[PDB]
Nucleic acid binder design. Structure first.
Lengths: 133, 53, 193
RNA sequence: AAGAAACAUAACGAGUACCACAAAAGGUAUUCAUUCAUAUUGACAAU
RNA sequence: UGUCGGCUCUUCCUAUCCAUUUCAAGCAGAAUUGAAAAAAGGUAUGAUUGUUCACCAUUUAAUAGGGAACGUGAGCUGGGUUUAGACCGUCGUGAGACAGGUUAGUUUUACCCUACCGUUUCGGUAGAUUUUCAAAGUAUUUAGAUAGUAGCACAACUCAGUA
């Protein structure tokens, strides 16, 4: 579902990392299980940066979302990362929205800003994104 | 859009051959022995299977 | 088993001159000059005259002679005799190989260089890569008609190999070749004259 | 240690018993022998 | 001759899981299946269990199978097993038995030779005499028998919703 390539973003989100769900789909927080497209190495933990599709579970939310595995996209992170034009930037919290494999967003709203890395990769997220930082 | 005349010469280069049941090698029509060494120069051959629409 | 003497000969027509120097036959005829080396350490190639017809007269021949030798080595007398025979044909009535192009849906364009020493195959099965296929010295390609080319030359070993080089560059890969009957095929092999 | 004849050898094939390994099976590969048929005024292959 | 497993690390085998090159299909395409060359490069993260094993949830191009004193304890750990305390169940008259379960139980020494990794010291290679030459010493510039070897893989766009 992703469109185009993504530059290097230093992945600051580990396995078993709890992130907020900025969506409106009754899921409060998600914990990362695996990262789609991650290439394994011995003893390494899966890593996710901005705009990275992940496989996550909801440990806090409505009964129709809790205790189930979902697919999420990382939209912001507290890990400092550098754009190719010499801009060093980082957000205030780690957050993600729930999207499916085709990329179409399940919800219809996003709270707070959205990184340009995630917005350009997934067009459906940018359409629902208030601001793109 | 291929003429039957062009079919005749294209099939012979590709289809009209024998196959060793052990070599799996492509053999001429009148061949009676697996040509390749690994299959032991076997003597059991079958025609190449035709296309069925 | 071992044959005491195996002999073969090739007749020289009027317009062909053959000179032999240590298994190095040079043949010069009306069309041009051809040369080859037959480095078999058990053959004796020499010119002579020999009556080859039951009632016909003597005629100039090249005799390929091999004495005591096993059937593995006795089989090369006729091979070399055939090779010299092809030279005489090549320098008198050269060889031409007519190749016809077959495609299913994508037309294939052949871009022949001005000298005729190179060709270009484009849009083969919709591909974007372009195949060049060089030609051996003495072999010339030309566009006979629509979707057809012929190769002109004197040496049957150079002409046939160049034609096979063109076909070998346009094989269909990872597809059922009993359905994708595409490529350049040799329609027939004949003489220029 | 020189000479003689062969079936081998285009292969890490062969090479001093006990000994330190190899089988069934297959080959229009090769050498020799037996049996049968076609062998000419003309068999086979090709034209 | 320190007797399980795990952790760390190197190397080897191919009876190849992936990537590369090929042939075959009851191979239209896509996805697959059988086989050949090839062992130079890769082959994961976790819940339960001391487990090897197993069985699940993912991720991946693939998450192949094995050896090296069932590789590897003066490399670690001590979870299991396998002393001495104690509990239960069955057996025994009893002391006591139980590849039955449970809990607590000291893991010593390299400064020796070699191997390996790095690092110094001393010694040193034979037939040329055009003095514009030849040889010995010191220093620099080079030389390269030999040994090792490194780049892989995936994704996106276009080809194309085309064959």
């Amino acid at each position: 579902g992703r469109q185009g390539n993504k530059f290097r973003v230093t992945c600051g989100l580990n396995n078993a990392s709890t992130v907020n769900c900025a969506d409106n789909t009754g899921a409060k927080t998600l914990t990362i299980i695996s990262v789609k497209g991650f290439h394994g190495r011995l003893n390494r933990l899966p890593r996710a940066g901005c705009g990275d599709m992940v496989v996550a579970t909801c440990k806090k939310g409505k009964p129709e979302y809790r205790k189930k595995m979902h697919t999420a996209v990382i939209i912001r992170q507290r890990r400092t990362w550098r754009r190719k034009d010499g801009v060093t930037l980082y957000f205030e919290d780690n957050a993600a929205v729930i999207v499916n494999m085709k990329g179409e967003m399940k919800g219809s709203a996003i709270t707070g800003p959205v990184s340009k890395e995630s917005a350009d990769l997934w067009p459906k997220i940018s359409s629902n994104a208030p601001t793109i930082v | 859009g291929i003429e039957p005349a062009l079919e005749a010469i294209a099939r012979k280069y590709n289809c009209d051959k024998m196959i060793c049941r052990r070599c799996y090698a492509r053999l001429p029509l009148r061949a009676t022995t697996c040509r390749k060494k690994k299959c032991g120069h076997s003597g059991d051959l079958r025609p190449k299977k035709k296309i069925q629409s | 088993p071992r044959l005491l003497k195996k002999t073969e000969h090739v007749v020289i027509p009027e317009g062909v001159n053959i000179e032999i120097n240590r298994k190095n036959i040079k043949v010069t005829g009306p069309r041009g000059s051809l040369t080859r080396e037959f480095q078999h350490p058990k053959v004796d190639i020499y010119a002579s005259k020999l009556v080859v017809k039951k009632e016909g007269p003597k005629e100039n021949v090249v005799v390929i002679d091999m004495w005591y030798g096993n059937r593995r080595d006795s089989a090369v007398v006729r091979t070399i005799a055939s090779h010299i025979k092809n030279m005489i044909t090549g320098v008198t009535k050269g060889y031409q190989y007519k190749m016809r192009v077959v495609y299913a849906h994508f037309p294939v364009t052949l871009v022949i260089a001005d000298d005729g020493k190179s060709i270009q195959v484009q849009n083969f099965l919709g591909e974007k890569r372009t195949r060049h296929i060089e030609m051996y010295d003495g072999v010339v390609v030309k566009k006979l008609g629509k979707d057809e080319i012929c190769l002109e030359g004197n040496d049957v070993e150079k002409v046939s190999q160049s034609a096979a080089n063109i076909h070998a560059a346009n094989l269909v890969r990872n597809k059922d070749i009993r359905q994708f009957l595409d490529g350049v095929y040799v329609s027939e092999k004949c003489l220029i004259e």
